Paper text:
To better resolve these regions, we used symmetry expansion followed by focused refinement, with masks focusing on the N- and C- terminal ends of VCP. Further, this allowed us to visualize the movement of the OTU domain (aa 215−355) using three-dimensional variability analysis (see “methods”), which contains the catalytic cysteine (C219) responsible for DUB activity, and the stalk region that connects to VCPID. From the density visible, the stalk region moves ~4 Å and the OTU domain moves ~13.5 Å from the first to the last state. Each VCPIP1 molecule makes two distinct contacts with VCP, one mediated by the UBX domain that engages the N-domain of a VCP protomer, and one with the VCPID that forms contacts with D2 domains of two adjacent VCP protomers.
Its core function is to unfold ubiquitylated proteins in an ATP dependent fashion. Previous studies have established that post-mitotic Golgi reassembly requires presence of VCP, as well as two adapter proteins, VCPIP138, and p4734,35. VCPIP1, also known as VCIP135, is part of the ovarian tumor protease (OTU) family of DUBs, an essential family of enzymes that remove ubiquitin tags from proteins to regulate protein homeostasis and function.
Residue numbers in the entry:
A (entry chain D): 546 to 671
B (entry chain F): 471 to 587, 593 to 700, 731 to 774
C (entry chain A): 471 to 588, 593 to 717, 724 to 765
D (entry chain E): 476 to 588, 593 to 646, 750 to 774
Write the structure that this text describes.
Amino acid sequence: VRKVRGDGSIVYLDGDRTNSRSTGGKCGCGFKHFWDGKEYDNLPEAFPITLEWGGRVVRETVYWFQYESDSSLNSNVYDVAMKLVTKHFPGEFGSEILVQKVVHTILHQTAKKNPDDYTPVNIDGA
Amino acid sequence: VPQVTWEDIGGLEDVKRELQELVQYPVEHPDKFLKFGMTPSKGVLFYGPPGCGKTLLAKAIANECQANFISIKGPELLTMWFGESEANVREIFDKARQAAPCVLFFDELDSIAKARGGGGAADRVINQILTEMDGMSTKKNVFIIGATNRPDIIDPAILRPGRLDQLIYIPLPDEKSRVAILKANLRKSPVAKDVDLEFLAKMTNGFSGADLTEICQRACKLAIRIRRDHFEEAMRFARRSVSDNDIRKYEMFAQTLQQSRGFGSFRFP
Amino acid sequence: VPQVTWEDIGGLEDVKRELQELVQYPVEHPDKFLKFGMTPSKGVLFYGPPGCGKTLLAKAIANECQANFISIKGPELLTMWFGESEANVREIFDKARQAAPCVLFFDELDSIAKARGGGGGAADRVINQILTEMDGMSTKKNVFIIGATNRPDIIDPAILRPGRLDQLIYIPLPDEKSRVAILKANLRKSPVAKDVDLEFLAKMTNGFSGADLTEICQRACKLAIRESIESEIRRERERQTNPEDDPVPEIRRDHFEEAMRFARRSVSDNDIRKYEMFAQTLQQS
Amino acid sequence: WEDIGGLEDVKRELQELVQYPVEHPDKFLKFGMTPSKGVLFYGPPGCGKTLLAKAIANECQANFISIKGPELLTMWFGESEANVREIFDKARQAAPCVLFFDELDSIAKARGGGGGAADRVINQILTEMDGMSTKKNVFIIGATNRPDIIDPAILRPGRLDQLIYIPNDIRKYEMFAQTLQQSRGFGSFRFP
C-alpha cells in the first residue's frame, strides 16, 4: 500500500504493479507495471555502464525498455545516453564523445539477441 | 543520366517527395525560388541499412530531373585519403560543375571515418568536400547526395546548414518496395508466370535490396543449370544481411531526430 | 565590406558596445588613444553555441566601421593543418594588412583542436603561425582579429593571453528582441503576409539559435514554393483537360505554422549550461 | 583435380562459378546474368586453396596469375598500392584468367588481428574489382587463413561475395562457417 495523489492515483513508485491492463506481456501479470512516472507493458531490463570523463567514475545502471507494445515507450540509446551524460556530467564540454560511447555500449549490451531471454529487473511485486 | 526510374525502387513516397523538392523544384522552377527568396538546399544525406537502394534513390532522382549523375564510391574516397590525394576532390566537383545540372553522389561518406576506427572526426578528404561545398555557387544546379551507413560517425561539420543539412532515413524496403525491387531485378531474365513475385516479397520481410538481389541471382543462376521450384531452392539460401539489432540503431536515430521537433503545436493568434 | 548591419541581429547591446570600443575607437579616435597612452586591443574571441551569430557579429562590426572583412572558415584551417601548409597564415595576414582597416575572422579557431580530439599539447602548426603573425603585426594598421570558437575550452591558451585575443566575449543564444531581428532579416526580400506576427513567432521560439530561426524561415519558404508548384500543376488537369488568381502570392501564416512542425532546437539546455559555466568560471576569477 | 582428394562440393561450386560463364556465355545472357567477379576461400593453412585455384584454372585452360602474401605486403610497405592496377592489367591481358590472391588477410594480419579494417592495398584491389569489365572473364579467388579479419568491404556483392570453406584450430573455422549459416534458416519458403 502507498499514499494517494488526491484524485485517487496511487503514488506508484518504481516497479509497482499498476491497475492498467498489460497490452504486451511476458510478465505473467496482465497489468502494466510502473517506472519513472510512466506505465510500461513489462519491467525494464537493466545493466551497469561505466561513464569515464574528467577522471570521474560513475556506476550508473541503464534500464532498457524493449518489448513494449505501444512502440513509443521503448528505450532509445540516443535519448538514454543524453540523459545519463547530462545527469552525471552536466554542462561539460566534449560530452558528445561520452554520449556516443554510451550509445555504443548500450547497443552492444542490448544486442545479446536472445529474445527468448528477458531478465526482468529484480523488483518485488508481481 | 541514369536509366534507373522511381519504379525500380517502388515505395519510399516521402523520400521521393523530399528528393523531388530538393532537386526537381529548383531546376524546373527557379522563378518560384527567386520569388520566395529561398536558397535551394545544397545537399542531402541518406542514412540507413546497407544495400537499401540509397544509390538507387540517387540515380532515380537524377533520372527524374534528367540530370547527370556522378557516383564517387567509397573506395575512391579511401584512395584519396590513403594517398593524400584529397586535392582531386576539387576537380571532381568541377566535373559535377561542368555537367550541370548534376547529382553528385558519395556512396560512402563514412568510409574514411570507418577506416580510422584517437583523433577527432575531421579528415583531409571530408575537409576538401566541405571546402568545395561551401565554395560552390548555388546558381549552378549541382546537388550533393551523401549516403552513409553510419549516420553518427560522419563528421558533424558536413550536416551544418549550407551543406548536407537534411538527413533522410532510407529504411529497409517494405512489401511494395520489395515487390518493385524483385520485379526490376527480374526484368532482363525469362521468368515464368507461375511465380507470384508478391507472395515471395511478403514472406521476405526485413530483406534489404541486396538480399533480394542475391536471392534472385541465386534463383536464376540455378535456372542457368525460371520456375517456382528454382526460386524456392535459391530462397533456401536466402540471408538477411541486416538484423533487427542493426535496424534498431537507425530506427531510434530517426526517432530521436523526429522527437526533437516538438513545436508542431505552434499556432498564430 | 559586409552588407550586414546591427539590425540583422538587433541584440547583444553590450557586445555591440565592446566591439565598437575595440574596433571603432582606434579607427575613429586615434587621437584619444595616443593621448591616453592605451594600446589598441589586437583582437577578441567570440565563444558561444553554434549558429548564434558570431559571424553575424563580426560582419556587422566590420560594416559599421566600413572596413574590409575577410573570413577564414574552420575548413581552411584544417586544410592548412592537414597539408602542413601553415605558411599560408602569413599571406592571409598580409591580405588583411593590404586591405587596412580589416577585421580578420576565424570561424572555428578550435577546428584543429577538435580534429586532434579535445596525446600532444594544446599547440599546433596553424595556431602557432597565427600567434606568430599576430605578434608580428604593425599594431597601428588597424587590423583586428576576431576569432570564433564553439569550444572555448580546447582553444590553445597561448591564443588567450594579453596582447593576443585577450578579450573573450560570450555570444549567447538570441533573446526575444534578437530573435525578432533575426526573423525580420531572414524574411527580408521574401513575400510574407502582413498578418504574420513575427513578434509572436520570436516569442514562442525561446532557446532557438539564429541558425534554427533561419531553418524555420527556409522551411516556410520551401512549403510556400511546394504549394505554388502544386497549384501550378493543378492548373493543368483542370485546364488543357477542361478548357488568373495567384494561389500563393505570399508566405502565409499556415506556412509558418507547418514549418514550425519541423523546427528543432540545435542548442540543448546542456550546451547553454556548458557555455554559462565557462563564462562563470572566467568571471569568478 | 586428382591432385586433391575429396571436396566434391567445393569443385562443384568452383566449376559452377568459373567454367559455365567461359563455356556458355549464351546461356548466361539468355538468363540475363552478371557472373560473379570472384570468390574467397577460407580454412586451415595448407589445405589446398592454391592447388584448388590451379585445378579450376586447368579445367578452364585459363591462365593462373598468383599474387602471394609477400607481394601484397611488399605493396603495403612503401605505399606501392598502385602496383595493384598493373596486376589486374596482367590479369586482363589473359582474357580467360584466374587471378589468385594467396593471402588477402596478410596485410590485415600485419596491422594486428589501432585503425579500422581498410588499407591501401585492399582498397586498390576493390577499386580494380569494381572497375573490372564483365566481358573479360577474369576471376579473383582470394584466400585467407583467418577470414574473420578480412576486410568486410571485399565480401560485398560485385566483389568476392562467395565464401567457401576449404577443410582447436578447426573449431574456429567450423564456428565461422556456422555463423555464415545459422541465420540462413529460411529454407522452408514454399510457393502457394
